[PDB]
Amino acid sequence: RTNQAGLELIGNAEGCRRDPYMCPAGVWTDGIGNGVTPGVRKTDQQIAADWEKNILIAERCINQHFRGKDMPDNAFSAMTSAAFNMGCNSLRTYYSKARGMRVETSIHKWAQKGEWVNMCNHLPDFVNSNGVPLRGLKIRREKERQLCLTGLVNEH
Template sequence: MQKKTWLAIALTAVAGFEGLRTTAYIDPVGIPTICFGHTAGVQIGDQKTVTECEALLTDEVVDFGLQVSNRAKVPLSHPEQAAYTSFAYNVGIGAFEQSTLLRKLNAGDRVGACNELPRWVYAKGIKLPGLVKRRAAERELCLSGLSNAHTSR
C-alpha cells in the first residue's frame, strides 16, 4: 500500500462503501439518509449538490477519525485508523466506544480488534451482504496496518 494518510484512505473507503445519493432516501434500517450515509437532521425530500455532499463527508470523516483517536489508547497505523474510522462512521461512535473491538484494541490485542470487524454485519437482526463486504474490506485494511505500525497522531 502506498503511504497515504489515514484521512485519504478513510475518505475513499467511506465514499465507496456508502455511495453517493444527492436526494434523501430511507436506508435499510429505516433512517432518512443523504449524500454518503449522512443521517443527522435528514428528511425525505431533502436534496444536496455533489459539492455539498463531498464537504459533508470530509467534515464527518475527520470528526469520526478524531473520535476514534480519542478513544484508542494505543497509537494507530494509518490503515488501522482508516478502518476504524470507516467502521465508526457506519455504526456510530457510541457502538464503537462500547465494542469488544475497542476493548481488545486498548488491551493491546490489535489482531483480535481487527478480527472483530466481521462480526458487525447485521442491521436490525438481518445480515446484510453489503455489510459483509464492507467489514471484510475494513478487516483487511486494518490487518494491513499491523506489519509496520506507525502512529497517525
C-alpha cells in the first residue's frame, strides 16, 4: 500500500549500503554491546533479499497497532516508512526514566484515536539510536511528517 512518496523515503537496499540511515531497523545494531553477546552482522545481500518483506512487516505494524486501515495513504505511507526504519516496538512504547517503566508513545495514542495530524506531528519524537540523538533521523522524521500531513491541513 505504501505510495510513491513513501517509497522514495524508504529507498532501496543499495541506498542502505551507501547511506546507512536508510537501513531497516533490524540492522542498526553495530557496536552497541553492553550481554547479550556479539553476533555476526547481516550481509548486504541478506538486506536486499529481505527488503520487501520488511516493508510488509512495517505495513503490518501500522495496520495492526496504529489503525493503518483507517488512515489516508499519505499518513499510512509516512508511518510505514517510520516503522521500517525504527521498528514497530519503538513506535509503540518507550522507556520513561521518570516513571521507571515502558509507557505508550504519544504517536501511538493519537493513532488509536484516529487523530492523524497529531500523530504525524509526533514523528520527530523518534530520532535516537541506542539512546543517542542523530541529525539524520531528525531530518527523516521531518520529511515523513510533511508527507503525513499532506491533505490533512490547509494547503496554503
